[PDB]
Every structure is written in C-alpha cells, then in structure tokens.
Amino acid sequence: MVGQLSEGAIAAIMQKGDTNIKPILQVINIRPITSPPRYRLLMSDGLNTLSSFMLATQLNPLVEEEQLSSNCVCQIHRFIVNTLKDGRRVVILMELEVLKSAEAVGVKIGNPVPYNE
C-alpha cells in the first residue's frame, strides 16, 4: 500500500530542501560506484522516484550485510541536501533505520513515477 510510504516527501525535498523530515521510503535499486564502494540509491516515496540519493559511507555495512537492499522499506533519520550548479539536488543519507526487509515487502509498492526535475 502507498499508505505505508511518505507520499510527497521527494517533492518536498526537491522544492523546499528542508531536512527536518523523517520520511519513510522504499529502496527501488542500489548501484555501487568505484577506494571504498560508494552506494547510489533509487528510492520511492510511493508517488515519485528519485535517483540522486547517496549513502554515507558509515552506512555501507547495511548494504554489504544486505539489510538495506532493493524493495526494503526504510525511515530516514538524518540527511543532507546539496544543490548542484545545474539545479539538481543530491540527497546524502547519513542515518536510517530499515523498517521492513526486502523479503518481507516482496515487491515495489505502487507505481511511482520519476520526479521530473
């Protein structure tokens, strides 16, 4: 159910840039970038997806132990927004808690669409 996710959080980050929210999001995909691997995440708030999430390196054990993996649901407890020269906003995830594992969720929630920058 999309009622499980923080519908509109991605739009709020993209437009207002406020970090004082603790949104509940679903991981759609993770990709490593290579030095330690740095993880880039495609997340959903049930309404939109956005692929400019970057994982802080302190959180890498969640991915390497597969606690944070595609289709899991997590709650963000601390994030930093950085706005690039061209207007894109990068979201750096500092602290998060996985609320429901990928195994338990099983599937993408809803039919979110890419945020149109």
Binding site: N29, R38, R40, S51, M54, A56, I80, N82, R88, I92
Partner: peptide, 29 residues
C-alpha cells in the same frame, strides 16, 4: 563524524554522483 569530515564526504558524494554517467537509463538525471 566531525563537521569538516562530513562536509568533505558530502562533496565527495556529490562528485561521485556527477561523474556517474555510464549508468543505465533508470539512473539518468
């Protein structure tokens, strides 16, 4: 976890993102 250490990591994560051009279509921004 210092303030300056976090700033350097935010900058690095942003450069990592900007140079990530060889990803598949779902990652295009």
């Amino acid at each position: 976890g210092t303030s300056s250490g976090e700033e350097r990591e935010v900058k690095k994560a942003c450069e990592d993102f900007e140079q990530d051009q060889n990803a598949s279509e779902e990652w295009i921004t």
